[PDB]
Design a protein around this ligand. Structure first.
Ligand code: 8ML
Ligand code: 8ML
Ligand code: CA
Ligand code: CA
Lengths: 675, 675
């Protein structure tokens, strides 16, 4: 039949791509081609409009199986061709060895690191439920799409997927349909060596629905029926167990050797002949497969055309909601939304930046409907919920509604991070955030790095940034954390010192379209600074205190800016004139013009950095660095600062030593380099 | 009864400690005091010998509940007193806000970051099973101890605990007995808001045994019976569901407000009067409680005295095993074990450092019985198994034996990291390791940081260190990873360039007693270097190529040392004389004498670093840095190096620019500083 021919075509495109690269993973593509064919035939999508907001989404969580995804996208006429398949895994191609959303048309998210994609699918489904609850009206199903995820044994072993699956079951996300490639083989061999749990019983315990397909090597009728069954279960996510043979058809089917290396040439020949293809030909695309797939595309395009007319009718019936939806689909924030950001003066009281963050959220959430977010069981400590908002929960629980704006992630930082990526991936201008303590953002590093690589504008509300948290002690106090994330490409790491800087950090985070943000916020109170403003802090680094005859400039962030200002006064008593630079975001600063940056960090003056954590990175901006390169301590925070000499006198002493060290030396800006 | 009085004493010590600090967590201590009393009465331990190798171990995974642990340790006469309890959460005390094994006698591991302790308990239990299988003989139960773990809802939400619980069930670890504080309250309120899964059904799916105690606020008889029941189930770890009231006894019992803040003074008064204590007194220790607990200590000490005689008899009957066991309990490696380390010369073939690592392991595993380790489903890629060894598996599976030495962790990096910490915590000189790709060590950051804080000599065999891995692409290629871990206190991060340096890295990792190691290893082949040796690489940094009239020194690591040597030759053709420094471990180098370090990085010469990852940290050792501060690419590795100009010509160009930039400048070593 044409369906059988399509499945063989998919299998052989994937195998031929791996062969051409002499690199990659043929096993799971061979095993999952029937399911991929069946799922894509049920999906609504437009190859010519990858951003249609009511499309069904597909996520390949087992991203090593990407030759399968690329084959589907090519066959359906996305902006990806057989010539791109021939360049699989080659430098600069549109067919990299794991899918990247920035590079591959039709790749919703970036996968490859196991466990991430299923969690991203939870986030796409969470966003779809929130979006539908916000906009749908009687006779106006603006959003009614599904989220389909493929995943393997490795994804099921990774703890992040357990976190997200527990939460998705709690959230009753009935438009999520996941498919487990139950092939009993991972890199180390049989799953009997390490993975003998009853997966299905575990997913039932989370509140998922289960469908089992025992013959998924051939039974596409049962796979399609499993989708139909899943769609009838509107209050549970569904896991479809696909019992497959890894490498189905290969001489080496059912072995670990077919997971991750190219097939032998004679194996590929026998695959082709058994399936009616020419063993002398590679990258064959039978025209009857193209015709069948084109029929489905044409039907999907008529569905999108009708959706566009539904949307036009919605704008007439619901003028305000319709204009809001249009603005969001255009990628634009509300006009002048930033007028809601709080502004402070030096006459205002000292406030912790966690509390300043709460106040910002309180003001901007009512103004910007596409902001949603939550906390990983730290709501009363991170201060991430705006009073008067409703939680995102299924209404059946009585605890919230899908129209809610605040997510109770539970103690699940890693899944929160990956779910945030999925909410961003949904689109519709979602600007979403997640709270935890800065030190426990590290639990989510796998997902955070993917926010950066995927260019998603997610925001971590990362409170309790330092030893300033006090008594909880060194297991809670960051040292390395900012260096880690600042060293990752494409992460804006804001460490605001006061009210105006906190508003600038949020302006950046919400306006972002391609850069994730981490906002490092304090437990302890900090004064409002003389010289701060949203305008200057928006530059990432700025001259807080200008001193034309400076003997030294002190550059600092966060809680240490006030310390630097106090040190300036001690230094004046010693006959040393200092300037102060505040550097709330190194990435934003780096992106400013060379001339602006040199106006902040000029030649001809020693520069000392002060920040109560690792000194790594700081030589970009300073000649000498005063930091904390050891673990913290459990005690009252002011006593810890005193212990480590993060006091006005301790900073002044080091500043004076810095001036002395450069006596009779020619000093150029740290911004200069040889290349 | 005296048991009731003991439980009240524990509760009130914990409450009084929190009150004195005006900080900390009274709720779970109040709820878990009955269980703690019951468990400690069943445990075998010596307060005067915290390292008895056949002790039962206790782990408080819900580490915020530490006032409970400290109260137990004080009551049992560990080296911790009521005066230390009065200093709870105060700077420098022996009673920090979360337990630290380095500081607190009787704290086996460091907890506070949720999820870790249960995984550490899995590792203690894994080690005990391996140890018992190695040493026990008929009539000689050298090791027969249990591992008891307390854990809360937050631990059960964290994905790391799911990973370890799946693995522990697979491994049939029947001497592990965990207790869930089922109090239905976390920081965000009722667990109904985020955590509605059927925990018990999930643990059954992992292959655990379950005991439920519905009245754990009072029913110590049932808690003791649950322990007895668990001990009869020798082939499954057990989860005991303790249904408790958080804050039991408080006016505010059963609320989130009692989780994490001190009780009101009037609440503490009514607690004391209802339990027969004086509301005017704090830190009361009734002498009848001390007497009862002392009776149990005395019995335990007689058990240890008999164990010492068993051990002496074992040494007579089994002289070789007995001497091996004695050496391990003394903390000493085999005499001259390091003679087994492979040595290379520049005439030997090029080898990837992952393969050099395999060869080291092959030679040292047969010589050093306390080495065990595994991989997170990457055995054939990390090359972490010595041929001819048997896997650690329950014999009932037919797949290994508990005497085995190689652990199949599955796709579980974070749990692997925390399990490694537990194996180290067991003691007996275990030197244990875990393989994954360097980029996915980041999945385990929560545990890695605790290896550093806890001072455990664990080792990550972290292959595929860079863009040199090639086609798998940027989701697999580290950029930030070494900077992250080098910025963490107390992590040795070895990036060996060749065979001799790889042997030095293992010498350091195996000899370690207080510092975790990460060995960053290549996929791609590297040449044997002229000038390398185990002796010089053991210094962490050394002069590979000395040039008395150097115009520049190039400092490099790993794969970039050979690149630097090739660049030296290009530079010679340009009339520039370079030296080369190899810096295989920055931490080890930093610990050398100032004079040694200055002999490697002298004054008076520009220094350029070369390493194909983040430049963060490198200004400690260089004036200019050539690194990679962007994500990688999917393609053949040599093509990626060429793209980013990590070629002999690209390094030479930057070296020449560096020489030019310092023309007419006075240059001092990067090792100098102002303070
Ligand atoms: C454990 C698995 C994986 C095991 C997955 O087992 P599975 O999910 O059951 O998939 P199959 O049914 O296809 O067997 S896949 C993976 C790769 O990195 C690919 O993403 C791996 O295959 C490498 O490409 C390969 O080892 C390179 O070989 P070499 O020639 O360089 O030696 N991988 C590593 C991995 C480990 N941990 C995370 C978080 N993500 C990952 N991708
Ligand atoms: C979510 C929980 C935790 C929630 C645990 O719920 P649970 O396990 O059910 O414990 P209970 O039964 O006692 O309620 S505990 C924790 C703390 O950091 C303590 O370790 C937290 O209590 C802080 O001390 C507190 O928020 C500070 O308050 P503030 O005055 O500064 O505002 N915590 C944070 C946490 C989050 N993630 C990880 C990995 N580890 C953690 N310890
Ligand atoms: Ca598999
Ligand atoms: Ca709880």
């Amino acid at each position: 039949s044409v369906d059988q021919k399509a499945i063989s075509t998919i299998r052989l495109l994937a195998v031929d791509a791996v062969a051409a690269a002499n690199s990659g993973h043929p096993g799971a593509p061979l095993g999952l081609a029937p399911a991929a064919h069946a799922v894509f035939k049920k999906m609504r999508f437009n190859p010519k409009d990858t951003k249609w907001i009511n499309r069904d989404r597909f996520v390949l969580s087992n991203g090593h199986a990407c030759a399968l995804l690329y084959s589907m996208l090519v066959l359906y006429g996305y902006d990806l061709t057989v010539e791109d398949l021939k360049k699989f895994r080659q430098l600069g191609s549109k067919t990299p060895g794991h899918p990247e959303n920035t590079d591959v048309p039709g790749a919703e998210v970036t996968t490859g690191p196991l466990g991430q994609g299923i969690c991203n699918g939870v986030g796409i489904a969470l966003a779809q439920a929130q979006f539908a609850a916000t906009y749908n009206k009687p006779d106006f199903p603006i959003s009614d799409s599904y989220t389909y995820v493929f995943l393997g044994d490795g994804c099921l072993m990774e703890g992040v997927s357990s976190e997200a699956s527990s939460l998705a079951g709690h959230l009753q996300l009935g438009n999520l349909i996941a498919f487990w490639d139950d092939n009993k083989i991972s890199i180390d061999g049989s799953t009997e060596v390490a993975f003998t749990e009853d997966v299905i019983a575990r997913y039932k315990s989370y509140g998922w629905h289960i469908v089992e397909v025992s013959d998924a090597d051939t039974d596409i009728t049962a796979i399609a029926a499993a989708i139909d069954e899943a769609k009838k279960v509107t209050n549970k996510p569904t896991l479809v167990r696909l019992t497959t043979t890894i490498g189905f058809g290969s001489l080496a089917q059912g072995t670990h050797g077919v997971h991750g290396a190219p097939l032998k040439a004679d194996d590929i020949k026998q695959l082709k002949t058994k399936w009616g293809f020419n063993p002398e030909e590679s990258f064959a695309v039978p025209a009857e497969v193209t015709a069948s797939y084109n029929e489905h595309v044409a039907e999907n395009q008529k569905i999108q055309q009708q959706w566009n007319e539904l949307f036009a009718a919605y704008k007439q019936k619901y003028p305000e909601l319709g204009a809001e939806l249009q603005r969001r689909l255009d990628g634009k924030l509300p006009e002048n939304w930033d007028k809601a950001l709080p502004v402070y003066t030096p006459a205002d009281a000292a406030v912790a930046t966690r509390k300043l963050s709460e106040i910002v959220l309180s003001k901007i959430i009512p103004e910007v409907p596409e902001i949603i977010g939550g906390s990983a069981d730290l709501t009363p400590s991170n201060l991430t919920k705006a009073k008067g908002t409703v939680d995102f929960q299924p209404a059946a629980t009585g605890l919230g509604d899908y129209s809610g704006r605040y997510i109770r992630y539970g103690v699940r930082e890693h899944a929160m991070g990956a779910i945030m990526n999925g909410i961003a991936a949904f689109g519709a201008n979602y600007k979403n955030y997640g709270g935890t303590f800065l030190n426990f953002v590290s639990y989510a590093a796998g997902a955070v790095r993917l926010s950066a690589l995927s260019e998603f504008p997610i925001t971590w509300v990362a409170t309790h940034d330092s030893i300033g948290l006090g008594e909880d002690g060194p297991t809670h106090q960051p040292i390395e954390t900012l260096a880690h994330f600042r060293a990752t490409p494409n992460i804006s790491v804001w460490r605001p010192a006061d009210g105006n800087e906190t508003s600038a950090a949020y302006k950046s985070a919400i306006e972002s379209t391609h850069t994730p943000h981490i906002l490092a916020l304090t437990r302890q109170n900090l004064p409002q600074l003389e010289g701060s403003s949203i305008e200057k802090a928006s530059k990432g680094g700025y001259t807080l205190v200008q001193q034309d005859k400076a003997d030294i400039i002190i550059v600092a962030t966060g809680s240490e800016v006030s310390l630097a200002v106090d040190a300036l006064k001690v230094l004046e008593g010693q006959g040393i004139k200092a300037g102060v630079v505040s550097l709330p975001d190194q990435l934003t600063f780096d992106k400013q013009s060379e001339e602006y940056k040199l106006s902040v960090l000029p030649d001809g003056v020693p520069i000392l950095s002060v920040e109560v954590m690792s000194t790594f990175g700081w030589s970009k901006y300073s000649h000498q660095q005063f930091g904390l390169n050891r673990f913290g301590a459990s005690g009252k925070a002011p006593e810890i600062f005193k212990l480590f000499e993060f006091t006005p006198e301790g900073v002044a002493e080091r500043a004076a030593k810095t001036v002395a060290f450069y006596k009779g030396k020619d000093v150029v800006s740290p911004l200069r380099s040889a290349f």
